Write a protein that binds this ligand. Structure first.
Ligand code: NAG
Ligand code: NAG
Lengths: 103, 438
Protein backbone atom coordinates (compact mmCIF):
# COMPACT_ATOMS: atom_id res chain seq x y z
CA UNK A 1 0.00 0.00 0.00
CA UNK A 2 1.06 3.59 -0.58
CA UNK A 3 -0.19 7.02 -1.69
CA UNK A 4 -0.19 8.13 -5.32
CA UNK A 5 -0.77 11.50 -6.97
CA UNK A 6 -2.56 11.89 -10.30
CA UNK A 7 -3.00 15.08 -12.33
CA UNK A 8 -6.57 14.63 -13.52
CA UNK A 9 -7.26 15.81 -17.03
CA UNK A 10 -9.54 18.80 -17.37
CA UNK A 11 -12.15 16.95 -19.43
CA UNK A 12 -12.02 13.70 -17.47
CA UNK A 13 -10.05 10.69 -16.29
CA UNK A 14 -10.52 6.93 -15.97
CA UNK A 15 -10.14 4.87 -12.80
CA UNK A 16 -9.36 1.16 -13.25
CA UNK A 17 -8.55 -0.75 -10.06
CA UNK A 18 -9.52 -4.19 -8.83
CA UNK A 19 -11.64 -6.64 -10.81
CA UNK A 20 -14.72 -4.50 -10.15
CA UNK A 21 -16.01 -2.05 -12.73
CA UNK A 22 -14.08 1.23 -13.08
CA UNK A 23 -15.29 4.77 -12.39
CA UNK A 24 -14.84 8.03 -14.29
CA UNK A 25 -14.06 11.31 -12.51
CA UNK A 26 -13.69 14.77 -14.06
CA UNK A 27 -12.34 18.13 -12.88
CA UNK A 28 -13.52 21.73 -12.63
CA UNK A 29 -12.31 25.07 -11.24
CA UNK A 30 -12.40 26.45 -7.70
CA UNK A 31 -10.05 29.46 -7.71
CA UNK A 32 -11.36 32.85 -6.45
CA UNK A 33 -12.32 34.44 -9.75
CA UNK A 34 -15.12 36.93 -9.21
CA UNK A 35 -14.32 40.11 -7.21
CA UNK A 36 -16.28 41.39 -4.20
CA UNK A 37 -16.75 45.05 -5.16
CA UNK A 38 -13.26 46.04 -3.96
CA UNK A 39 -9.81 45.82 -5.58
CA UNK A 40 -8.70 42.20 -5.85
CA UNK A 41 -5.93 40.03 -7.29
CA UNK A 42 -8.23 38.44 -9.84
CA UNK A 43 -5.43 37.40 -12.20
CA UNK A 44 -4.36 34.64 -9.80
CA UNK A 45 -7.59 32.78 -10.55
CA UNK A 46 -6.94 33.05 -14.29
CA UNK A 47 -3.36 32.04 -13.52
CA UNK A 48 -4.52 28.76 -11.96
CA UNK A 49 -6.57 27.87 -15.06
CA UNK A 50 -5.14 28.20 -18.56
CA UNK A 51 -1.61 29.40 -17.69
CA UNK A 52 -1.47 30.36 -21.37
CA UNK A 53 -3.69 33.24 -22.57
CA UNK A 54 -3.54 34.76 -19.05
CA UNK A 55 -0.08 36.39 -19.05
CA UNK A 56 -0.25 37.51 -22.68
CA UNK A 57 -3.05 39.92 -21.73
CA UNK A 58 -0.79 41.63 -19.20
CA UNK A 59 2.04 41.95 -21.73
CA UNK A 60 -0.33 43.35 -24.35
CA UNK A 61 -1.79 45.87 -21.91
CA UNK A 62 1.68 46.96 -20.82
CA UNK A 63 2.81 47.36 -24.43
CA UNK A 64 -0.31 49.33 -25.35
CA UNK A 65 -0.06 51.69 -22.38
CA UNK A 66 3.69 52.19 -22.89
CA UNK A 67 3.20 52.96 -26.58
CA UNK A 68 0.38 55.38 -25.79
CA UNK A 69 2.39 57.16 -23.11
CA UNK A 70 5.48 57.41 -25.33
CA UNK A 71 3.45 58.74 -28.25
CA UNK A 72 1.72 61.28 -26.01
CA UNK A 73 5.03 62.43 -24.52
CA UNK A 74 6.68 62.79 -27.92
CA UNK A 75 3.68 64.60 -29.39
CA UNK A 76 3.36 67.01 -26.47
CA UNK A 77 7.10 67.72 -26.51
CA UNK A 78 7.06 68.41 -30.25
CA UNK A 79 3.91 70.53 -29.95
CA UNK A 80 5.52 72.50 -27.13
CA UNK A 81 8.66 73.11 -29.19
CA UNK A 82 6.49 74.12 -32.15
CA UNK A 83 4.47 76.29 -29.78
CA UNK A 84 7.93 77.72 -29.13
CA UNK A 85 8.04 78.41 -32.85
CA UNK A 86 7.43 81.97 -31.52
CA UNK A 87 11.20 82.18 -31.22
CA UNK A 88 10.28 85.81 -31.54
CA UNK A 89 12.90 87.31 -29.22
CA UNK A 90 11.94 90.87 -30.19
CA UNK A 91 8.22 90.83 -29.25
CA UNK A 92 7.08 89.95 -25.74
CA UNK A 93 5.26 86.68 -25.06
CA UNK A 94 2.79 86.41 -27.94
CA UNK A 95 0.18 85.30 -25.39
CA UNK A 96 1.11 84.39 -21.78
CA UNK A 97 -1.86 82.02 -21.91
CA UNK A 98 0.13 79.83 -24.31
CA UNK A 99 3.16 80.29 -22.05
CA UNK A 100 1.02 78.65 -19.36
CA UNK A 101 0.34 75.80 -21.79
CA UNK A 102 4.07 75.49 -22.44
CA UNK A 103 4.85 75.82 -18.73
CA UNK B 1 -42.09 20.18 -39.91
CA UNK B 2 -38.31 19.79 -40.27
CA UNK B 3 -35.72 21.34 -37.96
CA UNK B 4 -31.92 21.19 -38.05
CA UNK B 5 -29.63 21.11 -35.02
CA UNK B 6 -26.08 20.13 -34.05
CA UNK B 7 -25.43 17.94 -31.01
CA UNK B 8 -22.20 16.87 -29.27
CA UNK B 9 -21.14 13.23 -29.46
CA UNK B 10 -21.62 12.19 -25.84
CA UNK B 11 -23.99 9.96 -23.82
CA UNK B 12 -26.33 11.13 -21.09
CA UNK B 13 -26.32 14.73 -22.35
CA UNK B 14 -29.90 15.74 -23.25
CA UNK B 15 -30.11 18.71 -25.62
CA UNK B 16 -33.18 20.94 -25.72
CA UNK B 17 -34.46 22.97 -28.66
CA UNK B 18 -37.53 24.79 -29.95
CA UNK B 19 -39.32 25.08 -33.29
CA UNK B 20 -40.80 28.44 -34.33
CA UNK B 21 -43.96 28.38 -36.44
CA UNK B 22 -46.44 31.23 -36.79
CA UNK B 23 -49.63 30.53 -34.86
CA UNK B 24 -48.13 27.44 -33.19
CA UNK B 25 -46.81 27.43 -29.64
CA UNK B 26 -43.05 26.71 -29.59
CA UNK B 27 -42.66 22.96 -29.15
CA UNK B 28 -40.04 21.65 -26.74
CA UNK B 29 -37.77 19.05 -28.36
CA UNK B 30 -35.44 16.91 -26.24
CA UNK B 31 -32.75 14.84 -27.97
CA UNK B 32 -30.62 12.22 -26.20
CA UNK B 33 -27.79 10.15 -27.67
CA UNK B 34 -28.31 6.96 -25.68
CA UNK B 35 -25.04 5.37 -26.82
CA UNK B 36 -22.55 5.09 -29.67
CA UNK B 37 -21.70 2.11 -31.88
CA UNK B 38 -18.60 2.38 -34.08
CA UNK B 39 -18.51 -0.75 -36.25
CA UNK B 40 -15.74 -1.07 -38.87
CA UNK B 41 -15.27 -3.46 -41.78
CA UNK B 42 -12.66 -6.16 -41.22
CA UNK B 43 -11.35 -9.25 -43.00
CA UNK B 44 -9.93 -12.43 -41.50
CA UNK B 45 -6.27 -12.87 -42.46
CA UNK B 46 -5.04 -15.93 -40.54
CA UNK B 47 -4.72 -17.55 -37.11
CA UNK B 48 -1.82 -18.38 -34.81
CA UNK B 49 -1.32 -20.32 -31.58
CA UNK B 50 1.21 -22.41 -29.70
CA UNK B 51 2.36 -25.32 -31.85
CA UNK B 52 3.85 -28.77 -31.25
CA UNK B 53 6.72 -30.40 -33.11
CA UNK B 54 6.20 -33.82 -34.70
CA UNK B 55 8.71 -36.51 -33.77
CA UNK B 56 7.70 -39.54 -35.86
CA UNK B 57 9.40 -42.90 -35.78
CA UNK B 58 12.65 -42.66 -37.77
CA UNK B 59 13.35 -44.83 -40.79
CA UNK B 60 16.22 -47.32 -40.51
CA UNK B 61 17.81 -49.00 -43.52
CA UNK B 62 20.19 -51.69 -42.34
CA UNK B 63 23.55 -52.19 -44.02
CA UNK B 64 22.29 -50.47 -47.18
CA UNK B 65 21.34 -47.10 -48.63
CA UNK B 66 18.39 -44.68 -48.65
CA UNK B 67 17.52 -41.16 -49.80
CA UNK B 68 15.63 -38.26 -48.23
CA UNK B 69 12.17 -37.26 -49.44
CA UNK B 70 10.27 -34.07 -48.70
CA UNK B 71 6.74 -33.90 -47.30
CA UNK B 72 3.84 -31.51 -47.86
CA UNK B 73 3.53 -30.93 -44.10
CA UNK B 74 4.18 -27.35 -43.05
CA UNK B 75 7.68 -26.45 -41.85
CA UNK B 76 8.86 -29.95 -42.76
CA UNK B 77 12.46 -31.08 -42.36
CA UNK B 78 14.27 -34.23 -43.47
CA UNK B 79 17.83 -35.54 -43.36
CA UNK B 80 19.77 -38.78 -43.68
CA UNK B 81 22.68 -40.00 -41.56
CA UNK B 82 25.08 -42.87 -42.19
CA UNK B 83 27.15 -44.83 -39.72
CA UNK B 84 24.23 -44.95 -37.29
CA UNK B 85 24.62 -46.60 -33.88
CA UNK B 86 21.19 -48.16 -33.24
CA UNK B 87 20.53 -49.63 -29.80
CA UNK B 88 17.40 -50.29 -27.77
CA UNK B 89 16.25 -52.22 -24.72
CA UNK B 90 15.90 -55.15 -27.10
CA UNK B 91 19.42 -54.35 -28.28
CA UNK B 92 21.10 -53.64 -31.58
CA UNK B 93 18.04 -53.26 -33.77
CA UNK B 94 19.82 -54.68 -36.82
CA UNK B 95 23.34 -55.89 -37.57
CA UNK B 96 26.09 -54.78 -39.94
CA UNK B 97 29.56 -53.45 -39.19
CA UNK B 98 28.48 -49.79 -38.98
CA UNK B 99 27.18 -49.95 -42.57
CA UNK B 100 23.59 -49.13 -41.63
CA UNK B 101 22.02 -45.68 -41.97
CA UNK B 102 18.87 -43.91 -40.80
CA UNK B 103 16.60 -41.21 -42.20
CA UNK B 104 15.00 -38.77 -39.77
CA UNK B 105 12.34 -36.13 -40.37
CA UNK B 106 9.95 -33.89 -38.48
CA UNK B 107 7.23 -31.27 -38.90
CA UNK B 108 4.87 -29.15 -36.80
CA UNK B 109 1.16 -28.99 -36.06
CA UNK B 110 -1.12 -26.89 -33.87
CA UNK B 111 -1.72 -28.42 -30.45
CA UNK B 112 -5.26 -29.38 -29.36
CA UNK B 113 -5.32 -26.55 -26.81
CA UNK B 114 -5.01 -24.19 -29.79
CA UNK B 115 -8.67 -24.97 -30.51
CA UNK B 116 -9.49 -22.47 -27.76
CA UNK B 117 -6.17 -20.58 -27.50
CA UNK B 118 -6.37 -19.37 -31.10
CA UNK B 119 -5.46 -15.76 -31.90
CA UNK B 120 -6.74 -14.23 -35.14
CA UNK B 121 -5.00 -11.48 -37.10
CA UNK B 122 -7.50 -8.97 -38.52
CA UNK B 123 -7.25 -6.30 -41.20
CA UNK B 124 -9.77 -3.49 -40.70
CA UNK B 125 -10.93 -0.42 -42.62
CA UNK B 126 -13.81 2.01 -43.17
CA UNK B 127 -14.99 2.59 -39.62
CA UNK B 128 -18.76 3.10 -39.52
CA UNK B 129 -20.67 4.70 -36.65
CA UNK B 130 -24.18 3.84 -35.43
CA UNK B 131 -26.08 6.26 -33.17
CA UNK B 132 -29.19 5.64 -31.10
CA UNK B 133 -31.34 8.72 -30.55
CA UNK B 134 -34.33 9.22 -28.26
CA UNK B 135 -36.49 12.27 -28.99
CA UNK B 136 -39.21 13.70 -26.74
CA UNK B 137 -41.77 16.09 -28.23
CA UNK B 138 -45.11 17.11 -26.76
CA UNK B 139 -44.53 14.77 -23.81
CA UNK B 140 -44.32 11.92 -26.33
CA UNK B 141 -41.18 9.79 -26.57
CA UNK B 142 -39.99 8.26 -29.85
CA UNK B 143 -36.80 6.38 -30.71
CA UNK B 144 -34.55 5.62 -33.64
CA UNK B 145 -31.21 3.99 -34.41
CA UNK B 146 -29.40 5.21 -37.52
CA UNK B 147 -26.05 4.92 -39.24
CA UNK B 148 -24.06 8.12 -38.78
CA UNK B 149 -24.27 8.73 -42.54
CA UNK B 150 -26.47 11.60 -43.67
CA UNK B 151 -28.13 9.67 -46.50
CA UNK B 152 -29.94 6.76 -44.77
CA UNK B 153 -32.77 7.92 -42.50
CA UNK B 154 -33.99 5.21 -40.14
CA UNK B 155 -37.44 3.75 -39.58
CA UNK B 156 -39.44 4.47 -36.42
CA UNK B 157 -43.20 4.95 -36.74
CA UNK B 158 -42.31 5.16 -40.45
CA UNK B 159 -40.50 8.42 -39.60
CA UNK B 160 -37.40 9.42 -41.56
CA UNK B 161 -34.70 10.97 -39.36
CA UNK B 162 -31.16 11.63 -40.58
CA UNK B 163 -27.94 12.42 -38.72
CA UNK B 164 -24.32 13.21 -39.50
CA UNK B 165 -21.90 13.05 -41.13
CA UNK B 166 -19.43 13.62 -38.28
CA UNK B 167 -17.47 16.85 -38.05
CA UNK B 168 -14.28 14.78 -37.70
CA UNK B 169 -13.45 11.10 -38.14
CA UNK B 170 -12.17 9.19 -35.11
CA UNK B 171 -11.27 5.50 -34.88
CA UNK B 172 -9.09 3.86 -32.20
CA UNK B 173 -8.62 0.84 -34.46
CA UNK B 174 -5.54 0.62 -36.69
CA UNK B 175 -5.12 -1.10 -40.04
CA UNK B 176 -3.64 -4.20 -38.38
CA UNK B 177 -5.05 -5.77 -35.20
CA UNK B 178 -5.15 -9.10 -33.37
CA UNK B 179 -7.83 -10.76 -31.23
CA UNK B 180 -7.03 -13.36 -28.56
CA UNK B 181 -9.24 -14.70 -25.76
CA UNK B 182 -11.53 -11.68 -25.97
CA UNK B 183 -8.65 -9.18 -25.84
CA UNK B 184 -7.85 -6.91 -28.79
CA UNK B 185 -4.24 -5.84 -29.36
CA UNK B 186 -2.99 -3.19 -31.78
CA UNK B 187 0.00 -4.61 -33.65
CA UNK B 188 1.37 -4.81 -37.20
CA UNK B 189 1.14 -8.56 -37.68
CA UNK B 190 3.37 -10.08 -40.38
CA UNK B 191 1.60 -10.61 -43.68
CA UNK B 192 0.32 -14.07 -44.57
CA UNK B 193 2.98 -16.29 -46.09
CA UNK B 194 5.78 -14.50 -44.20
CA UNK B 195 7.48 -16.78 -41.67
CA UNK B 196 10.00 -15.26 -39.24
CA UNK B 197 11.19 -17.50 -36.38
CA UNK B 198 10.92 -16.00 -32.92
CA UNK B 199 8.13 -13.57 -33.83
CA UNK B 200 4.38 -13.14 -33.58
CA UNK B 201 2.34 -15.22 -36.00
CA UNK B 202 5.11 -17.74 -36.67
CA UNK B 203 2.47 -20.39 -37.43
CA UNK B 204 -0.20 -19.23 -39.89
CA UNK B 205 -3.31 -20.92 -41.25
CA UNK B 206 -6.33 -19.86 -43.29
CA UNK B 207 -8.65 -21.55 -40.77
CA UNK B 208 -8.28 -23.21 -37.39
CA UNK B 209 -8.92 -26.71 -38.79
CA UNK B 210 -7.20 -26.26 -42.16
CA UNK B 211 -5.31 -29.32 -43.35
CA UNK B 212 -3.05 -27.10 -45.47
CA UNK B 213 -0.58 -25.07 -43.39
CA UNK B 214 2.55 -23.02 -44.02
CA UNK B 215 5.23 -22.23 -41.45
CA UNK B 216 8.98 -21.89 -40.93
CA UNK B 217 10.63 -21.90 -37.50
CA UNK B 218 14.23 -22.95 -38.23
CA UNK B 219 14.28 -26.64 -37.35
CA UNK B 220 17.67 -28.35 -37.74
CA UNK B 221 18.26 -32.07 -37.28
CA UNK B 222 21.11 -33.36 -35.12
CA UNK B 223 23.16 -36.44 -35.93
CA UNK B 224 22.65 -39.52 -33.73
CA UNK B 225 25.09 -39.25 -30.84
CA UNK B 226 24.20 -41.94 -28.26
CA UNK B 227 23.83 -45.69 -27.83
CA UNK B 228 20.09 -45.91 -28.43
CA UNK B 229 17.92 -44.78 -31.33
CA UNK B 230 17.09 -41.11 -30.79
CA UNK B 231 16.29 -38.04 -32.88
CA UNK B 232 17.71 -34.85 -31.34
CA UNK B 233 15.86 -31.81 -32.70
CA UNK B 234 16.81 -28.17 -32.17
CA UNK B 235 14.30 -25.37 -32.74
CA UNK B 236 13.69 -21.79 -31.67
CA UNK B 237 11.18 -20.97 -28.95
CA UNK B 238 7.57 -20.66 -30.08
CA UNK B 239 6.66 -17.11 -31.05
CA UNK B 240 3.14 -17.27 -29.61
CA UNK B 241 4.32 -17.48 -26.01
CA UNK B 242 6.95 -14.88 -26.92
CA UNK B 243 4.36 -12.32 -27.99
CA UNK B 244 2.28 -13.34 -24.96
CA UNK B 245 5.06 -12.57 -22.48
CA UNK B 246 5.64 -8.98 -23.68
CA UNK B 247 2.50 -8.26 -25.69
CA UNK B 248 2.14 -4.89 -23.98
CA UNK B 249 -0.97 -3.51 -22.36
CA UNK B 250 -4.37 -4.12 -24.00
CA UNK B 251 -6.21 -1.56 -26.08
CA UNK B 252 -8.83 -1.29 -23.33
CA UNK B 253 -6.27 0.76 -21.38
CA UNK B 254 -5.22 2.90 -24.37
CA UNK B 255 -8.38 3.82 -26.31
CA UNK B 256 -8.94 7.60 -26.41
CA UNK B 257 -12.26 8.87 -25.06
CA UNK B 258 -12.74 5.63 -23.12
CA UNK B 259 -14.15 3.59 -25.99
CA UNK B 260 -15.86 0.45 -24.67
CA UNK B 261 -14.66 -2.24 -27.08
CA UNK B 262 -16.55 -5.51 -27.63
CA UNK B 263 -15.06 -8.47 -29.45
CA UNK B 264 -17.84 -10.47 -31.11
CA UNK B 265 -18.53 -7.55 -33.51
CA UNK B 266 -15.00 -6.22 -33.03
CA UNK B 267 -16.59 -2.81 -32.51
CA UNK B 268 -16.49 0.12 -30.11
CA UNK B 269 -19.43 1.55 -28.18
CA UNK B 270 -20.20 4.26 -25.63
CA UNK B 271 -17.30 6.35 -26.96
CA UNK B 272 -17.76 10.12 -27.15
CA UNK B 273 -16.05 12.56 -29.51
CA UNK B 274 -17.07 15.06 -32.18
CA UNK B 275 -20.23 16.86 -33.27
CA UNK B 276 -23.20 15.58 -35.27
CA UNK B 277 -25.63 17.65 -37.38
CA UNK B 278 -29.14 16.21 -37.56
CA UNK B 279 -32.50 17.01 -39.14
CA UNK B 280 -35.68 15.99 -37.31
CA UNK B 281 -39.07 15.81 -39.03
CA UNK B 282 -42.12 16.20 -36.79
CA UNK B 283 -45.75 15.66 -37.89
CA UNK B 284 -47.86 18.80 -38.12
CA UNK B 285 -50.58 17.21 -35.99
CA UNK B 286 -48.12 17.09 -33.09
CA UNK B 287 -48.05 20.90 -33.10
CA UNK B 288 -50.65 22.88 -31.16
CA UNK B 289 -52.12 26.20 -32.25
CA UNK B 290 -51.38 29.23 -30.09
CA UNK B 291 -55.14 29.87 -29.81
CA UNK B 292 -55.57 27.05 -27.28
CA UNK B 293 -52.16 27.63 -25.68
CA UNK B 294 -52.18 29.36 -22.28
CA UNK B 295 -51.69 33.13 -22.40
CA UNK B 296 -49.15 34.72 -20.06
CA UNK B 297 -48.65 38.34 -19.07
CA UNK B 298 -46.10 40.50 -17.25
CA UNK B 299 -43.51 37.83 -16.45
CA UNK B 300 -40.26 38.52 -14.60
CA UNK B 301 -37.15 36.62 -13.53
CA UNK B 302 -35.14 36.43 -10.32
CA UNK B 303 -31.87 34.60 -9.63
CA UNK B 304 -32.29 33.56 -6.00
CA UNK B 305 -28.74 32.16 -5.98
CA UNK B 306 -26.36 30.56 -8.46
CA UNK B 307 -23.09 28.64 -8.19
CA UNK B 308 -20.49 28.20 -10.92
CA UNK B 309 -20.75 24.43 -10.48
CA UNK B 310 -19.66 21.79 -12.97
CA UNK B 311 -22.81 19.82 -12.15
CA UNK B 312 -26.40 21.09 -12.43
CA UNK B 313 -26.63 23.31 -9.36
CA UNK B 314 -28.02 26.60 -10.64
CA UNK B 315 -31.41 27.82 -9.46
CA UNK B 316 -33.82 30.42 -10.82
CA UNK B 317 -37.34 31.71 -10.25
CA UNK B 318 -40.01 33.33 -12.41
CA UNK B 319 -43.22 35.18 -11.56
CA UNK B 320 -45.98 35.44 -14.15
CA UNK B 321 -49.47 36.82 -14.71
CA UNK B 322 -51.88 34.86 -16.90
CA UNK B 323 -55.54 34.32 -17.74
CA UNK B 324 -55.76 30.64 -18.78
CA UNK B 325 -54.94 27.39 -16.98
CA UNK B 326 -52.81 24.69 -18.56
CA UNK B 327 -49.18 23.95 -19.38
CA UNK B 328 -46.50 25.93 -21.17
CA UNK B 329 -42.90 25.11 -22.11
CA UNK B 330 -39.82 26.93 -20.85
CA UNK B 331 -36.58 27.42 -22.75
CA UNK B 332 -33.28 29.31 -22.80
CA UNK B 333 -32.00 30.50 -26.18
CA UNK B 334 -28.59 31.24 -24.62
CA UNK B 335 -26.32 28.25 -25.24
CA UNK B 336 -24.17 29.02 -22.19
CA UNK B 337 -27.02 27.86 -19.93
CA UNK B 338 -29.25 24.78 -20.05
CA UNK B 339 -32.50 24.18 -18.16
CA UNK B 340 -33.71 20.92 -16.56
CA UNK B 341 -37.49 20.74 -17.14
CA UNK B 342 -39.10 21.86 -20.39
CA UNK B 343 -42.70 22.61 -19.40
CA UNK B 344 -44.81 23.37 -16.34
CA UNK B 345 -48.29 24.34 -15.22
CA UNK B 346 -49.52 27.93 -15.50
CA UNK B 347 -51.84 29.80 -13.12
CA UNK B 348 -53.36 33.28 -13.19
CA UNK B 349 -50.64 34.85 -11.02
CA UNK B 350 -48.40 31.95 -10.04
CA UNK B 351 -44.63 31.89 -9.67
CA UNK B 352 -42.41 28.84 -10.13
CA UNK B 353 -38.75 27.93 -9.68
CA UNK B 354 -36.38 26.24 -12.11
CA UNK B 355 -33.16 24.22 -12.02
CA UNK B 356 -30.44 24.83 -14.59
CA UNK B 357 -26.70 24.82 -15.25
CA UNK B 358 -24.21 27.15 -16.91
CA UNK B 359 -20.66 27.10 -18.26
CA UNK B 360 -19.80 30.71 -17.32
CA UNK B 361 -19.85 32.65 -14.03
CA UNK B 362 -21.58 35.64 -15.66
CA UNK B 363 -25.14 34.29 -15.44
CA UNK B 364 -26.68 36.81 -17.82
CA UNK B 365 -29.02 35.54 -20.52
CA UNK B 366 -32.53 35.42 -22.01
CA UNK B 367 -35.09 32.76 -21.10
CA UNK B 368 -38.58 32.25 -22.49
CA UNK B 369 -41.59 31.27 -20.41
CA UNK B 370 -44.31 29.75 -22.60
CA UNK B 371 -44.04 31.94 -25.73
CA UNK B 372 -42.77 35.13 -24.13
CA UNK B 373 -39.11 36.05 -23.55
CA UNK B 374 -37.38 37.80 -20.66
CA UNK B 375 -33.86 38.89 -19.76
CA UNK B 376 -32.32 37.73 -16.49
CA UNK B 377 -28.87 38.33 -14.99
CA UNK B 378 -26.75 37.31 -12.00
CA UNK B 379 -23.25 36.23 -10.97
CA UNK B 380 -22.13 32.77 -9.87
CA UNK B 381 -19.34 31.55 -7.60
CA UNK B 382 -16.94 28.59 -7.93
CA UNK B 383 -17.81 25.56 -5.79
CA UNK B 384 -15.97 24.10 -2.82
CA UNK B 385 -15.84 20.64 -4.42
CA UNK B 386 -13.82 20.67 -7.64
CA UNK B 387 -13.63 17.02 -8.76
CA UNK B 388 -16.73 15.24 -10.09
CA UNK B 389 -17.35 12.76 -12.89
CA UNK B 390 -21.02 13.53 -13.50
CA UNK B 391 -22.06 15.34 -16.72
CA UNK B 392 -20.09 18.57 -17.04
CA UNK B 393 -19.87 21.35 -19.62
CA UNK B 394 -23.21 20.69 -21.26
CA UNK B 395 -22.03 23.71 -23.26
CA UNK B 396 -18.31 24.21 -23.81
CA UNK B 397 -16.70 27.44 -22.67
CA UNK B 398 -16.86 30.32 -25.16
CA UNK B 399 -14.23 32.62 -23.62
CA UNK B 400 -17.11 34.06 -21.57
CA UNK B 401 -15.46 33.40 -18.20
CA UNK B 402 -14.44 37.07 -18.34
CA UNK B 403 -16.54 39.02 -15.83
CA UNK B 404 -18.54 42.22 -16.20
CA UNK B 405 -16.26 43.83 -13.62
CA UNK B 406 -13.30 42.67 -15.72
CA UNK B 407 -14.84 44.38 -18.77
CA UNK B 408 -15.37 47.57 -16.78
CA UNK B 409 -11.76 47.52 -15.54
CA UNK B 410 -10.38 46.78 -19.02
CA UNK B 411 -12.45 49.60 -20.51
CA UNK B 412 -11.20 51.98 -17.80
CA UNK B 413 -7.64 50.79 -18.49
CA UNK B 414 -7.36 51.49 -22.22
CA UNK B 415 -6.87 55.20 -22.83
CA UNK B 416 -7.79 57.49 -25.68
CA UNK B 417 -4.30 58.60 -26.67
CA UNK B 418 -5.44 58.79 -30.30
CA UNK B 419 -7.67 61.76 -29.49
CA UNK B 420 -4.80 63.37 -27.58
CA UNK B 421 -2.43 63.09 -30.55
CA UNK B 422 -5.12 64.32 -32.96
CA UNK B 423 -5.80 67.38 -30.81
CA UNK B 424 -2.07 67.99 -30.45
CA UNK B 425 -1.59 67.90 -34.21
CA UNK B 426 -4.57 70.22 -34.77
CA UNK B 427 -3.29 72.80 -32.29
CA UNK B 428 0.20 72.37 -33.76
CA UNK B 429 -0.95 73.25 -37.28
CA UNK B 430 -3.00 76.16 -35.93
CA UNK B 431 0.06 77.53 -34.11
CA UNK B 432 2.21 76.97 -37.20
CA UNK B 433 -0.19 79.10 -39.23
CA UNK B 434 -0.35 81.74 -36.49
CA UNK B 435 3.44 82.00 -36.60
CA UNK B 436 3.56 81.99 -40.39
CA UNK B 437 1.61 85.20 -39.85
CA UNK B 438 4.69 86.69 -38.14
C1 NAG C 1 32.10 -45.62 -39.42
C2 NAG C 1 32.07 -44.14 -39.16
O1 NAG C 1 31.75 -43.67 -38.07
N1 NAG C 1 32.41 -43.36 -40.19
C3 NAG C 1 32.43 -41.91 -40.12
C4 NAG C 1 32.75 -41.30 -41.48
O2 NAG C 1 31.73 -41.66 -42.41
C5 NAG C 1 32.85 -39.79 -41.38
O3 NAG C 1 33.29 -39.25 -42.62
C6 NAG C 1 33.84 -39.40 -40.29
C7 NAG C 1 33.90 -37.91 -40.05
O4 NAG C 1 33.78 -37.60 -38.67
O5 NAG C 1 33.46 -40.00 -39.04
C8 NAG C 1 33.44 -41.43 -39.08
C1 NAG D 1 -48.72 16.99 -23.02
O1 NAG D 1 -48.86 18.38 -22.72
C2 NAG D 1 -50.12 18.94 -23.10
C3 NAG D 1 -50.05 20.42 -22.81
O2 NAG D 1 -50.94 20.78 -21.75
C4 NAG D 1 -51.25 18.24 -22.35
O3 NAG D 1 -52.50 18.76 -22.78
C5 NAG D 1 -51.19 16.74 -22.61
O4 NAG D 1 -52.16 16.07 -21.82
C6 NAG D 1 -49.80 16.19 -22.28
N1 NAG D 1 -49.72 14.78 -22.60
C7 NAG D 1 -49.48 13.83 -21.68
C8 NAG D 1 -49.43 12.42 -22.19
O5 NAG D 1 -49.30 14.10 -20.50
Amino acid sequence: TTSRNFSVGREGLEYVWGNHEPVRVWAQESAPGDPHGWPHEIIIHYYHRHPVYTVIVLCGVALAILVGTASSAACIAKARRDCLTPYALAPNATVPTALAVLC
Amino acid sequence: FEHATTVPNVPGIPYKALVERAGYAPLNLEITVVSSELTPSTNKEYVTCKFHTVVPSPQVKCCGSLECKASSKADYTCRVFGGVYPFMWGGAQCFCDSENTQLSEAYVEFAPDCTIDHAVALKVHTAALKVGLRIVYGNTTARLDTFVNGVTPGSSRDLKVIAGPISAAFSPFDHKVVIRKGLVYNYDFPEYGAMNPGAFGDIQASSLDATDIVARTDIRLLKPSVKNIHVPYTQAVSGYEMWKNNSGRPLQETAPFGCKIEVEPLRATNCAYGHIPISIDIPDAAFVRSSESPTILEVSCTVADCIYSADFGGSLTLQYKANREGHCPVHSHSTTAVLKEATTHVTATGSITLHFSTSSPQANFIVSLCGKKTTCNAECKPPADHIIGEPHKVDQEFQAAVSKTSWNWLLALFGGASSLIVVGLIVLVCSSMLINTR
